[PDB]
Design a protein around this ligand. Structure first.
Ligand SMILES: OC[C@H]1O[C@H](O[C@H]2[C@@H](O)[C@H](O)[C@@H](CO)O[C@@H]2O)[C@@H](O)[C@@H](O)[C@@H]1O
Ligand SMILES: OC[C@H]1C[C@@H]2N[C@@H]2[C@@H](O[C@H]2O[C@H](CO)[C@@H](O)[C@H](O)[C@H]2O)[C@@H]1O
Length: 341
């Protein structure tokens, strides 16, 4: 009852910086988003960071090998065997260095790493293919690189921004630039957002291998409404698709999106997380994703947080629970998920 689960994916963000390592407390400092219907910036000082919560590890660097060790030990505590790494195609030496550091640290703990392909500028199926080839070439032989039944796995965020007719070229076995039957074949997991009438043909026509839902906030989309998960799984099974619902402990992003309060989901001392995780397991899925390890801007993190009140902000915290509660509660749910597999 302590081993890692390799069908449990935890979304991980490597974009945090410190002045010492990165030259700026990157992401702890963050622009405040204008209201879609100034706004200024959060300066990323000790007192004022771009989160409604406050990390136990402080304003850390994602490139600090000592932080990475600590994070891998947290994954072990949570029993989450796969780190699903945000990937922004920065094409810079700092990105390349950090990915290697994360793979190296993960391997010491038998954690695996897969990539979460983000909506980088001009993303399209051709440069996606080239980037999948690059990632598999660079990292595919690393011992921590994830495979499921012989295949890499990628999550594709906001996949609906690319038309199914383009996806088909990459993901159908007959597609013009197919990855199927090549050295670069992979399980491609697209984002299910809206109603079945839209999403079912999208997924089929795009030739995705499966789908995930991402959002930690229940009801934000059809896909992130857990009462839909039984029927989504039924459809997945009938159509040979892998459904990987995303569960999270809460949501709050109002430091960076002050206009977005309607998306707040309160943690209620863990009861929100328990409810969402239970629904995923009851749906009878093969794999679960966790939003998130450390999306601190969106308040979905399971990473330890501490009480903190500064002269600039009174942070939220884990209340009646201890800082590592969400790690240990994840481990509880991983056990229940395994019991179901
Ligand atoms: O606008 C706030 C909203 O922004 C982000 O989500 C956007 C997009 O990535 C999603 O696919 C669609 C889903 O309908 O919504 C937005 O356009 C997220 O940061 C989200 O959590 C946030 O509420
Ligand atoms: O990993 C998928 C998304 C997770 C999270 N909603 C953000 C998206 O990133 C945008 O918003 C971040 C702040 O929450 C911002 O730092 C980043 O630059 C944005 O691209 C992720 O795409």
């Amino acid at each position: 009852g302590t081993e890692l689960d390799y069908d449990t994916f935890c979304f991980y963000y490597d974009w945090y910086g410190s002045e010492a390592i990165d030259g700026q407390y990157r992401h702890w400092a963050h622009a405040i988003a204008p209201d879609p219907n100034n706004p200024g910036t959060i300066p990323g000082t000790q007192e004022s960071i771009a989160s409604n919560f406050y990390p136990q590890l402080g304003r850390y660097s994602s490139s600090d090998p000592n932080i990475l060790t600590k994070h891998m030990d947290m994954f072990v505590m949570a029993r989450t065997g796969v780190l699903a790494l945000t990937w922004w195609n920065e094409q810079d030496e700092t990105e390349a260095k950090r990915i290697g550091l994360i793979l190296d640290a993960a391997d010491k703990k038998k954690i695996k790493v897969c990539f979460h392909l983000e909506p980088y500028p001009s993303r399209n199926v051709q440069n996606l293919r080239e980037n999948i080839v690059k990632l598999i070439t660079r990292y595919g032989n690393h011992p921590a690189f994830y495979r499921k039944d012989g295949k890499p796995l990628f999550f594709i965020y906001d996949s609906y921004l690319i038309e199914p007719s383009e996806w088909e070229k990459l993901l159908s076995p007959g597609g013009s630039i197919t990855i199927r039957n090549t050295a670069y074949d992979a399980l491609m997991i697209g984002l299910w957002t809206s109603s079945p009438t839209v999403q079912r043909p999208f997924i089929l026509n795009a030739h995705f291998d499966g789908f995930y839902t991402y959002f930690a906030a229940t009801g934000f989309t059809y896909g992130s409404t857990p009462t839909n998960w039984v029927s989504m799984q039924k459809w997945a099974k009938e159509n040979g698709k892998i459904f990987i619902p995303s569960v999270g402990p809460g949501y709050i992003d109002t430091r960076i999106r002050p206009w977005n309060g309607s998306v707040i989901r309160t943690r209620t001392d863990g009861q929100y997380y328990d409810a969402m995780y239970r629904k995923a397991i009851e749906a009878g899925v093969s794999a679960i994703s966790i939003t998130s390890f450390n999306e601190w801007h969106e308040g979905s993190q399971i990473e330890p947080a501490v009480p903190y009140t500064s002269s600039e902000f009174t942070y939220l915290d884990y209340e009646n629970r201890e800082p590592d509660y969400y790690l240990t509660r994840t481990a509880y749910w991983v056990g229940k998920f395994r019991e179901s597999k």
